Amino acid sequence: MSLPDGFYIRRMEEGDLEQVTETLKVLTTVGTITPESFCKLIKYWNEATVWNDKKIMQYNPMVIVDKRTETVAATGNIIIERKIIHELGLCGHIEDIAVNSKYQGQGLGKLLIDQLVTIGFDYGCYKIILDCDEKNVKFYEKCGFSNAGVEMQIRK
Amino acid sequence: GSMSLPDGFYIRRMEEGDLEQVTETLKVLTTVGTITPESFCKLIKYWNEATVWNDNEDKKIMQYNPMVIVDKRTETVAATGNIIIERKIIHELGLCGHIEDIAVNSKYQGQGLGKLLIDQLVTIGFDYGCYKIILDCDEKNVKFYEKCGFSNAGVEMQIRK
Ligand SMILES: CC(C)(COP(=O)(O)OP(=O)(O)OC[C@H]1O[C@@H](n2cnc3c(N)ncnc32)[C@H](O)[C@@H]1OP(=O)(O)O)[C@@H](O)C(=O)NCCC(=O)NCCS
Ligand SMILES: CC(=O)N[C@@H]1[C@@H](O)[C@H](O)[C@@H](COP(=O)(O)O)O[C@@H]1O
Ligand SMILES: CC(=O)N[C@@H]1[C@@H](O)[C@H](O)[C@@H](COP(=O)(O)O)O[C@@H]1O
């Protein structure tokens, strides 16, 4: 599970605004975001912790960076939830996976999911889930995931 | 902070004292296990204080919204469900609600209690300003959820420790 030479993964930072918004736009609508508001979002994500009786960050936004060009090749996040079931169990929610086109087909998506999963299991999650489009199911099965249900949504 | 619902039920946020009844209810869903009153009390404290950053400081956004529907006839918990609020970067730093852990006690099944619960959770998420609310269900319940206004949006994938 190591990244290809030249690429590294790290927690998303305030200075990533431009590259991250650009990357996420290939996934869905992003819209207008100011540096000021992004600053605020990053502080929230950097401070929210999950009660643990070892510090658990509720948000774990990652970026994989191609060091040569300082370009964000991909981004993904894993959100940690504490429940009552499974003896006050922890559940990880992988969200907002996006790999830039120029960087796909190189194994970076799988390595990103692998790193997110590791973050979750290291925190003690009894399970990690995510929702994907039917056309991405095979990629997720190759990351070790299995079909568990149907995602249902309702929009405002 | 209680709200009456049709047919002699009312809804309210979960409390420390609901441990025994909530434990029994969630077993309808999956393993609950052993949970002490002190641990449960700490969980409730965490759930009552965790907020999602926002600018309407007049309406705090609770990260966790653990609800119980109590049967007035018996003053016992009939159902429980939660909606967890997540702040994203997409949709202009949008909010996504995640409905989780829906458990209706078996004596109440077939009474429309599930719908009542889901409808209240959705209201809670949209009142917070969520652009969408999602949940994962078994194939069997897709129809039930469609009766609640939800539509098939994708596939839930998991990996277990
Ligand atoms: C994340 C995503 C881009 C794939 O990332 P990726 O870096 O291209 O994929 P990887 O190189 O890590 O591939 C891992 C494995 O999954 C397979 N795979 C990737 N995409 C696949 C597809 N569409 N169909 C089938 N298998 C696929 C690869 O062949 C590889 O398997 P192998 O090791 O047996 O060869 C894609 O699966 C996805 O979910 N896209 C939606 C979100 C996003 O990034 N979107 C913009 C799309 S334009
Ligand atoms: C595994 C993964 O990345 N799933 C994503 C989800 O996290 C993201 O929020 C959403 C955006 O779609 P939306 O704009 O319709 O909400 O797409 C996919 O479901
Ligand atoms: C809509 C709904 O209620 N979905 C629940 C989910 O929230 C819960 O965590 C899980 C328990 O199953 P588990 O023990 O397999 O985690 O069951 C269902 O998928």
UniProtKB/Swiss-Prot annotation, chain B:
Report the residue ranges that make up the N-acetyltransferase domain in this protein: 30-161
What pathway does this protein act in?
Nucleotide-sugar biosynthesis; UDP-N-acetyl-alpha-D-glucosamine biosynthesis; N-acetyl-alpha-D-glucosamine 1-phosphate from alpha-D-glucosamine 6-phosphate (route I): step 1/2
Q: Give the GO terms filed under biological process for this record.
A: UDP-N-acetylglucosamine biosynthetic process
UniProtKB keywords: Acetylation, Acyltransferase, Transferase
The EC number of this protein is 2.3.1.4
- Report the enzyme's class at the first EC level: transferase
Catalysis: reaction(s): D-glucosamine 6-phosphate + acetyl-CoA = N-acetyl-D-glucosamine 6-phosphate + CoA + H(+)
Binding, acetyl-CoA: I102, A103, V104, G110, Q111, G112, L113, G114, K115, Y145, E146, K147
A GO CC annotation recorded here is: cytoplasm
Binding-site positions, D-glucosamine 6-phosphate: T30, K88, I89, I90, H91, E100, D101, I102, Y131, K132, D136, R160
Q: Which family does it belong to?
A: Belongs to the acetyltransferase family. GNA1 subfamily.
What's the miscellaneous note? Present with 2550 molecules/cell in log phase SD medium.
Q: How does it assemble?
A: Homodimer.
Name listed for the protein in its UniProt record: Glucosamine 6-phosphate N-acetyltransferase
| Originating organism | Saccharomyces cerevisiae (strain ATCC 204508 / S288c) (Baker's yeast)
Q: What is the lineage of its organism?
A: Eukaryota, Fungi, Dikarya, Ascomycota, Saccharomycotina
What gene is behind this protein?
Answer: GNA1
